[PDB]
Amino acid sequence: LYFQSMDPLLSVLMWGVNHSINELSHVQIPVMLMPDDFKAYSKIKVDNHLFNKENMPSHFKFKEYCPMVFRNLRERFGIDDQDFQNSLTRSAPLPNFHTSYDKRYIIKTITSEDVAEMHNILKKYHQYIVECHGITLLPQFLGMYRLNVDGVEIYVIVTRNVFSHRLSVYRKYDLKGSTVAREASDKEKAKELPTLKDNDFINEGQKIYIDDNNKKVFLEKLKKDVEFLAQLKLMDYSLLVGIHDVERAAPGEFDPNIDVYGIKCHENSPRKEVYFMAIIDILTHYDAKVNPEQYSKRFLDFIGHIL
Amino acid sequence: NLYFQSMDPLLSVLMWGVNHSINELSHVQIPVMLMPDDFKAYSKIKVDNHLFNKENMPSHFKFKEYCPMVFRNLRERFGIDDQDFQNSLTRSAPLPNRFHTSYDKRYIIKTITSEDVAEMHNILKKYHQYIVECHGITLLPQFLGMYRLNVDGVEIYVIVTRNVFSHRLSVYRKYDLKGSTVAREASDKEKAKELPTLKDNDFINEGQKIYIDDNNKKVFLEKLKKDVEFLAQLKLMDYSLLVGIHDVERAEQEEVECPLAPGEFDPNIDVYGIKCHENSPRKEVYFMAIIDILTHYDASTVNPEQYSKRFLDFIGHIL
Ligand SMILES: CCOc1ccccc1-c1ccc(-c2nc3c(c(N[C@H](C)C(=O)O)c2C#N)CC=NC3)cc1
Ligand SMILES: CCOc1ccccc1-c1ccc(-c2nc3c(c(N[C@H](C)C(=O)O)c2C#N)CC=NC3)cc1
Numbered sequence: 193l194y195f196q197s198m199d200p201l202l203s204v205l206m207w208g209v210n211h212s213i214n215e216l217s218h219v220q221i222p223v224m225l226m227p228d229d230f231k232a233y234s235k236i237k238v239d240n241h242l243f244n245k246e247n248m249p250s251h252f253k254f255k256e257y258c259p260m261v262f263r264n265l266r267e268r269f270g271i272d273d274q275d276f277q278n279s280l281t282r283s284a285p286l287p288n289f290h291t292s293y294d295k296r297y298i299i300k301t302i303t304s305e306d307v308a309e310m311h312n313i314l315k316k317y318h319q320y321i322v323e324c325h326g327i328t329l330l331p332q333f334l335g336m337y338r339l340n341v342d343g344v345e346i347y348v349i350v351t352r353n354v355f356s357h358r359l360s361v362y363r364k365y366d367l368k369g370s371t372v373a374r375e376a377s378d379k380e381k382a383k384e385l386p387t388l389k390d391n392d393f394i395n396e397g398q399k400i401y402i403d404d405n406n407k408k409v410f411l412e413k414l415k416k417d418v419e420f421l422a423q424l425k426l427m428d429y430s431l432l433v434g435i436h437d438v439e440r441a442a443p444g445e446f447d448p449n450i451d452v453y454g455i456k457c458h459e460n461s462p463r464k465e466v467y468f469m470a471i472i473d474i475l476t477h478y479d480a481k482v483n484p485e486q487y488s489k490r491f492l493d494f495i496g497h498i499l
Numbered sequence: 500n501l502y503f504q505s506m507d508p509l510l511s512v513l514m515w516g517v518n519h520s521i522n523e524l525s526h527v528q529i530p531v532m533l534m535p536d537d538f539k540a541y542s543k544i545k546v547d548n549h550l551f552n553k554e555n556m557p558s559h560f561k562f563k564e565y566c567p568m569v570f571r572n573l574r575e576r577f578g579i580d581d582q583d584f585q586n587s588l589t590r591s592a593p594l595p596n597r598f599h600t601s602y603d604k605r606y607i608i609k610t611i612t613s614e615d616v617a618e619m620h621n622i623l624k625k626y627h628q629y630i631v632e633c634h635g636i637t638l639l640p641q642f643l644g645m646y647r648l649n650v651d652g653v654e655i656y657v658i659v660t661r662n663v664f665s666h667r668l669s670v671y672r673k674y675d676l677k678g679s680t681v682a683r684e685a686s687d688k689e690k691a692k693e694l695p696t697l698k699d700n701d702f703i704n705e706g707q708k709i710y711i712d713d714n715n716k717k718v719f720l721e722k723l724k725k726d727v728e729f730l731a732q733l734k735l736m737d738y739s740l741l742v743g744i745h746d747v748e749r750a751e752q753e754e755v756e757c758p759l760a761p762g763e764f765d766p767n768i769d770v771y772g773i774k775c776h777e778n779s780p781r782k783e784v785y786f787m788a789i790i791d792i793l794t795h796y797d798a799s800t801v802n803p804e805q806y807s808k809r810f811l812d813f814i815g816h817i818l
Binding site: 219241243 | 500501502503515518522523525526527528536537539540541542543544545546547548549550551552555567568
C-alpha cells in the first residue's frame with residue numbers, strides 16, 4: 193500500500209483514512225459519547241522534503257470531524273474499523289461521486305455549509321441511530337473530512353452504498369414525490385446507467401413487487417425516518433432505487449449484512465428482481481430555503497403509491 | 500493496545516512520532532540504494548486536536564524526522580527490524596537514567612542540540628558509506644533515528660542509538676574512558692549514585708582489570724583502530740570508550756532474594772559483549788563500544804590525530 197493516485201486529493205483521502213483509523217486504535221472506546229465529542233476534530237499537516245516524493249504530494253492537510261462519533265456510528269451500523277480502513281485504502285476509489293474500490297461505500301465532495309449542517313443535526317442523528325438500533329433507511333454517515341493539497345481545499349463525506357457491493361443494477365431512480373414534474377435530461381439519459389426521476393418511473397410504468405410483510409416493514413421504517421427528517425426541518429431528499437435483474441445472469445442471492453438495503457421481489461413477480469432502496473441527500477434545511485411536514489407527507493404518499 | 504501516555508509530554512510525542520514514522524515507512528518502497536537527496540530529506544507532521552484524545556496526549560505538537568530513508572537503511576544494516584524497533588520505543592515509555600533507555604533496554608534516547616543535528620548531517624554520507632564497507636561490524640555508535648519534537652513551547656532534538664550494554668544482563672560497574680588530559684574522575688555527587696559513570700582515574704585507582712583472552716583483545720583493538728582512524732579523518736574528537744561490566748555472581752545473589760545460562764548472552768542482540776577468559780578471578784562479561792562522537796575540531800587542546808593516538812594508546816594499555 194502506497195496510496196498512489198493520479199488524483200492527489202484521493203491519495204490524501206486514502207492516506208487520511210489510513211491515519212484516522214490507526215490513530216483511533218490508540219484511543220479507548222468510551223462507555224458513551226459526551227457533548228464535547230460532537231464538537232471535536234483532529235487536524236494533521238504534513239510537509240515532506242525529498243521524502244516519499246513519488247507516491248504522494250509533499251505538502252498536505254487532513255482534518256477529521258468528530259472522530260469518536262463517526263467511529264461509534266460505524267460500530268452501530270455493523271462496520272469494523274479495519275474492514276472500513278481496508279475498503280477505502282487498499283485500492284483507490286473509482287469515480288462513478290466516487291465508490292470505494294470494493295463498492296461498499298460512497299465518497300462525496302460537499303460544501304462547508306453541508307459540513308455545518310452535519311454538525312447542526314449530528315447529536316439528534318446519533319440519538320436516532322441509538323434509538324432505532326441502527327435499523328433505518330437514513331444515510332449511514334461513516335466519516336467526514338477536510339483535505340488541502342496544492343492550494344485546493346475540499347470537504348468529503350462517506351456513506352454506505354444503497355446498492356449491492358456485487359449484484360449489478362440495470363436501472364436506477366431518484367424519487368421525491370415532486371408535484372412539479374422531474375424527468376432525467378437527454379444528457380443523463382445518454383448514459384449506460386442513467387439516474388432517472390419521478391416522471392421516468394411513471395412513464396415507464398415501473399413496478400416494484402415486494403411481499404406484504406416486506407412492504408409493511410419497509411414503509412414503517414420509512415415513515416419514522418421521514419418524521420425524524422421533518423422534525424429537523426430537513427427536506428429535498430430522495431428515495432434512491434436500484435433494480436437488479438436476476439434473469440440477466442448463486443443468481444438471486446445477497447448477504448443482508450453487507451447489502452443491507454436489498455429486498456427480494458414477490459415470488460409471483462413477472463420478472464425475477466432484487467431492489468435496493470434507501471433515502472439519500474438529506475442535508476437541506478428549511479431556513480436555507482412547500483414546507484418540511486408537507487414535503488415528508490408528499491414524499492411518503494408517492495412511495496406508498498408505487499410500493 | 501498502546502496510548503503513548505506519559506507524565507512527560509515529550510516522551511508522549513516521541514512515542515507517537517516513532518510509531519507514525521515507522522508506519523509511514525511501511526508505505527514507502529525500500530530503494531535498491533540511497534541517493535544524495537535522501538541525506539537532506541525530512542518529514543514534518545504538525546498535529547492539532549480539539550476535544551479529542553485529550554487524556555492520553557497533548558493536543559498540539561510537531562514531530563520532524565531527519566533523513567528517514569537513511570535511518571531505515573541504517574537500522575537494516577545494524578540488524579534491526581523496523582517493527583521490533585517500533586515496539587521497543589512505543590510499547591511502554593522510555594525510562595530516564597541524562598538519557599533514557601527504551602523500556603526493554605535495547606536502545607538509548609538522548610536529547611542533543613541543534614549543532615549536534617548539523618554535525619550528524621555533516622558526517623551522514625561518510626558514516627553510511629563506512630557502515631556499508633564494514634558490513635555493520637563496528638564499535639561506532641549505531642545511529643538509528645533522529646527527530647525534532649515540539650510541545651508546550653519546548654523544542655528538543657533527539658537521537659536514538661543502540662545500547663552498549665546488555666538488554667538482559669545487568670551492569671554493576673561502568674566507565675567513560677578517554678585517557679590523557681585529566682583529573683578525570685567522577686565527582687563526589689556522581690559516585691553517590693547506585694551505578695555511577697566512573698572515569699579514567701577511577702579505572703586505574705580502583706585497580707579495574709578486563710580479563711579477555713588474546714584473540715578477543717586483538718580482534719577488538721583492530722576494530723577500535725579502524726573506527727578511531729575513521730573518526731580522525733572526519734576531524735571528530737572528545738569521544739569515549741564506554742565499558743560496562745556484568746558480574747555473574749552478583750546478579751545471582753541479588754536475584755535469589757526475589758534458556759540462556761548465567762553469564763551467557765545473545766551476541767546477535769547484545770552485539771558488544773565479550774566473555775571473560777577462563778582464568779578470570781570472577782566470572783564477568785564486558786560491554787565496550789565508542790560513544791559521544793560528534794565534536795568537530797574547528798569547534799593547549801589536541802588535534803584529532805593526537806586525540807586518536809592517545810585514546811588507542813590508553814585503551815591498549817588497560818586492555
Ligand atoms: C449533493 C449533496 O450531497 C451530499 C451533501 C451532504 C451530505 C451528503 C451528500 C450526499 C452523499 C451521498 C450521496 C449519494 N449516495 C449514494 C449514491 C449516490 N449516487 C447518485 C445520486 C447517483 O447514482 O446519481 C449518491 C450521490 N450523489 C448511490 C448509492 N448509494 C448512495 C448523495 C449526497
Ligand atoms: C552529549 C551529546 O550526546 C550526543 C550528542 C550527539 C549524538 C549522540 C550523543 C550521545 C548519544 C548517546 C550516548 C550514550 N550512549 C550510551 C550510553 C550512554 N550513557 C551515559 C554516558 C552514562 O552511562 O552515563 C550515553 C549517554 N549519555 C549508555 C549505554 N549505551 C550507549 C551519549 C551521547
